[PDB]
């Protein structure tokens, strides 16, 4: 039960062939040039530095992947909001990744102020900030609470209601919508049904892969602890029963506008790319 | 299909079974804040200035009826912000008028600029533009999704892509939002951004919603209802399906219970108040 390793090779088949069927458009990956990995590298760096924590490149790099495979390229329009999810998915996945006795909020909230001023129009800086503050205070608040232990062992559908914010899918759609510039999307953004609707293609994801790490730190947020992982038949009715989750979500995806889907469907594959590479 | 147009035959049944559920897990009842006679003045006023650019003349009567959701449905207890009570009053009924307009009549740029004159007068400055943002989202998403395929699908496939699309919808989300600050307590403030309270209260609020509103709705053609979802006219399969629901409800209040007593008291008060105030 402490690891799915039997399962890797057979569920990440599975999952491809799923989206294979369903989805059939593959994630491309945004290339940046030279100068813009630096200037995102540059100010990942000075966004904790405050924390004083250090950050290799090459750790830059493996966080900010996500982004790049998991956007949609052929409907950007704004590279600068482009650089600032890059930048903000960075410098908050090193957040996510610390003790929280290192977690200094006014030290860290001006810095996630000042990428927002930066790249963003002033309405777009203030809902990718905010968004921003909800997922790093989350974070911090259900630390050992027992909000997060009800949510993540009663059901499915409350461990999936918890994550929309938790997983930063609903942070995700904020400070994204202004790469696309499109007038449904952003709507979907602003009331966080673009996240309700990806949550659980993202988080079956990056549950089935990250569960051998998260149960070996003693860490609960996964749905995978909802089973029984070393009986198989329990097991594989699970998996199954995610599959369709994601499935009937991806099938109502498609029924957005094409721009939209296109973008959903990206993020949920693109992220499941980028997972297994 | 005239059986399945009706849900009369179960209506004192199931008011029988909500209250009874509501006793074992509830427990505590609603109470109704009175506003004086010179605050309801005061909401109708800002109601009927509100809508007047619309050409909407609303009674009174008519108002206070929209206004008896927030009066039965906030936690009295916990109220520390009468002037953001009061907004979430005057919100609350001319975006039910909004809701209830001929979508021709829908003139955005003569609402939402009385919205934004509502919260600035009501609410703090950052208060004040939460609550703003929150009523531009749910009116634009009522006007986006009349006629739209995302609606039919969302409606028509499983109870949880329909729970998913009324967290929006029933305006709940926006409920929360505007709500916050009439407590001034720091953990119901964060669930409310994060949308966590709005999530946790979407079942209970649609379920009975859904209930009480189904005769009208389906006699308008009107499809965003879950007991749409079952056949209505077999009895069999109703009482299943309400069940279900009725589960959903109970596993939402049992979860609720986990979370720190002000907020768990204003989030049953929100789902019981708004059963007491429906069926009244
Ligand atoms: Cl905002
Ligand atoms: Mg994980
Ligand atoms: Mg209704």
Known sequence: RSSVRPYLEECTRRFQEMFDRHVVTRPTKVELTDAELRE??????????????????????????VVLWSQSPRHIKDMEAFKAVCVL???????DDMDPALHDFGLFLPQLRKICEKYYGPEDAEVAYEA??????????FRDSPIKAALCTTSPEQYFRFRV?????????????????HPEFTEH?????????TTRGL?????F??????VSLGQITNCFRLCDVSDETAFKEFFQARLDDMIEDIECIKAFDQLTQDVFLDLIYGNFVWTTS
């Open 203 to 207: 988080t079956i994801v990056n549950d």
């Open 189 to 197: 953004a602003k009331t966080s049904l673009a996240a309700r609707m």
């Open 40 to 65: 995102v590298i540059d100010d990942c760096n000075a966004a904790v530095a405050p924390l004083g924590k250090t950050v290799s490149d090459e750790r830059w790099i493996s966080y900010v992947g």
């Open 165 to 181: 914010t938790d997983i930063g899918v609903d942070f995700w759609m904020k400070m994204s919508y202004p790469i696309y510039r």
């Open 209 to 214: 892969y990250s569960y051998d790490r998260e």
């Open 132 to 141: 921003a503050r909800a997922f790093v205070t989350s974070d911090h608040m």
């Open 89 to 95: 998915n960075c410098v908050t996945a090193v957040w």
